[PDB]
Design a protein around this ligand. Structure first.
Ligand SMILES: Nc1ncnc2c1ncn2[C@@H]1O[C@H](COP(=O)(O)OP(=O)(O)OP(=O)(O)O)[C@@H](O)[C@H]1O
Ligand SMILES: [Ca+2]
Lengths: 40, 357
C-alpha cells in the first residue's frame, strides 16, 4: 500500500509545471529584506 | 496546520514554510560557544575573538548532534518564530546519509522538539522534484561538497552517485590564492568574506578556457574592479573565470579527482543502460555553487563531447537553483498526496527511531 501512495505523490510532482519567476521574484523579495537587517 | 521545511546545508541553513516559493530564514550553519551561553549563525561569527566556532555539518553530514540540536532550536524559535510542537517538519539529508544519523535526526525532532509528524528527504531528490521531475541526474554543488545524484522514479542510484570534495569554500579559497600574487594580500578571515563577495558577483565560467585566457591576455574587456571596505577600487582580470574553472579542472588546486563535467558523465555511465538517455536529457543543476553565469552552456559543451554524438543532452538550471533544494521540500510537504507519507509521533513512540526507513 506504500508503493501506491508513493506513486500518487510522484504523479503529482510529474504533473507539476514550475513557475520560475513567481519563485525568482519571491526569492528576490525575501533576499532584499534579509539584506535590510543590516542597520548597524 | 501548515508544515515546516528545513534544509540543513554545510555552509548555510535554509528554512521556511511549506507552500512558500522561497525560504524565510537563511543563516550560516555555525555554532559558537564561549567557556561561559552559545550563539548561532551570524551572531557567532561577529565574535570570533570571544567565541570558537564549529560547523556541525561537514560535507552534508551531521557530525555534531549537540550543536545541531541548537541550530534546529535557533531555527524554530528565533528565525521562523514558531512552535514546532504543532507543525510537521520536513528535514533534508545528504545523499548516502548513514541510517544512524537519520534515526538520531528523528529522535531529536520528536523528543527534544515534540514535532507532531516528520519526514526526511534526500537533498538532491528535492531538487529534481522542484523542476517537476522524478527522473534525471542532479548536480548538487554547495558550500562543502559537490554531488552527482542519478535519480529514477524517486529513488537515487547510490552506487552511481559520484561525489567531489570541492565546493564554495575551495573556490573562495582559490580566489584568494590567485588574487594574492597579482599583488593583493587576502589572507585573514575578514578579507575572505569580501573575496567570497568578489566570487558571487564578478565570477563567471568560460565556455572555452584557453580562448578566454587569450582574450584577457590581449585586452581588458573582461576587466572588473572591486572596492574593499576602505575605499580602494581594484582590477581583476582572468581571475573571474579561473576561479570557477577548478570545478571543471580540479587540477588547479592539486586534485587528481575528475571535473564536475566528467563526474556527471561517469555517474550516468554506471546507471542502467535503460535510463542513461533520460539522465542525459534531464541534467538538473542545484545548489549555490552552480550559480555562476554560463555554467549551463559550459556543462552543455563538455557533456556533448563525452556523451554519444547522437545523444539528447538537456541541462536544466533554474534561476532560483540556489534555493532549489528547499523549494522541492516546500513543494513536497504541501502536496495533499504526501500527508500519509508523514511519520507521525504516535508511531515513533510505538516503533522507535527505526521507523523512518
Ligand atoms: N552567484 C553565486 N555565485 C557563486 N557562488 C555562490 C553564489 N551564490 C551563493 N554562492 C556560494 O554557494 C554556497 C552556498 O550555497 P548552498 O546553500 O547550496 O551551500 P550548502 O547547502 O550550505 O552546503 P552543502 O550543499 O555542501 O551541504 C556558498 O559557498 C556561496 O558562496
Ligand atoms: Ca545543500
Amino acid at each position: 500500500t506504500f508503493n501506491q501512495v508513493r506513486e500518487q505523490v510522484m504523479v503529482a510532482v510529474q504533473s507539476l509545471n514550475p513557475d520560475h519567476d513567481s519563485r525568482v521574484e519571491a526569492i528576490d523579495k525575501a533576499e532584499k529584506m534579509w539584506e535590510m537587517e543590516r542597520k548597524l | 496546520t501548515t508544515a515546516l521545511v528545513c534544509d540543513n546545508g554545510s555552509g548555510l541553513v535554509k528554512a521556511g514554510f511549506a507552500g512558500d516559493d522561497a525560504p524565510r530564514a537563511v543563516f550560516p550553519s555555525i555554532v559558537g560557544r564561549p567557556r561561559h551561553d552559545s550563539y548561532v549563525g551570524d551572531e557567532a561569527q561577529s565574535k570570533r575573538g570571544i567565541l570558537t566556532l564549529k560547523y556541525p555539518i561537514e560535507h552534508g553530514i551531521i557530525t555534531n548532534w549537540d550543536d545541531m540540536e541548537k541550530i534546529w532550536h535557533h531555527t524554530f524559535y528565533n528565525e521562523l518564530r514558531v512552535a514546532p510542537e504543532e507543525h510537521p517538519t520536513l528535514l533534508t539529508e545528504a545523499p548516502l546519509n548513514p541510517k544512524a544519523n537519520r534515526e538520531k535526526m528523528t529522535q531529536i525532532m520528536f523528543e527534544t522538539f515534540n514535532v507532531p509528524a516528520m519526514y526526511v528527504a534526500i537533498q538532491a531528490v528535492l531538487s529534481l522534484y522542484a523542476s517537476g521531475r522524478t527522473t534525471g541526474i542532479v548536480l548538487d554543488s554547495g558550500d562543502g561538497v559537490t554531488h552527482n545524484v542519478p535519480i529514477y522514479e524517486g529513488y537515487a542510484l547510490p552506487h552511481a552517485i559520484m561525489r567531489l570534495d570541492l565546493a564554495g569554500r575551495d573556490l573562495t579559497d582559490y580566489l584568494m590564492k590567485i588574487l594574492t600574487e597579482r599583488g593583493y594580500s587576502f589572507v585573514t578571515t575578514a578579507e575572505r568574506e569580501i573575496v567570497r563577495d568578489i566570487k558571487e558577483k564578478l565570477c563567471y565560467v568560460a565556455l572555452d578556457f584557453e580562448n578566454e585566457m587569450a582574450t584577457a591576455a590581449s585586452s581588458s574587456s573582461l576587466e572588473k574592479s572591486y572596492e574593499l571596505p576602505d575605499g580602494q577600487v581594484i582590477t581583476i582580470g582572468n581571475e573571474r573565470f579561473r576561479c570557477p574553472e577548478t570545478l571543471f579542472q580540479p587540477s588547479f588546486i592539486g586534485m587528481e579527482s575528475a571535473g564536475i563535467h566528467e563526474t556527471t558523465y561517469n555517474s550516468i555511465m554506471k546507471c542502467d543502460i535503460d535510463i542513461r538517455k533520460d539522465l542525459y536529457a534531464n541534467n538538473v543543476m542545484s545548489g549555490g555553487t552552480t550559480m555562476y553565469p554560463g555554467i549551463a552552456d559550459r556543462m552543455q559543451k563538455e557533456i556533448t563531447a563525452l556523451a554519444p554524438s547522437t545523444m539528447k543532452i538537456k541541462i536544466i538550471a533554474p534561476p532560483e537553483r540556489k534555493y532549489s533544494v528547499w523549494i522541492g521540500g516546500s513543494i513536497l510537504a504541501s502536496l495533499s498526496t504526501f500527508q500519509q507519507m508523514w511519520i507521525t509521533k504516535q508511531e515513533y513512540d510505538e516503533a522507535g527511531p527505526s521507523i523512518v526507513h
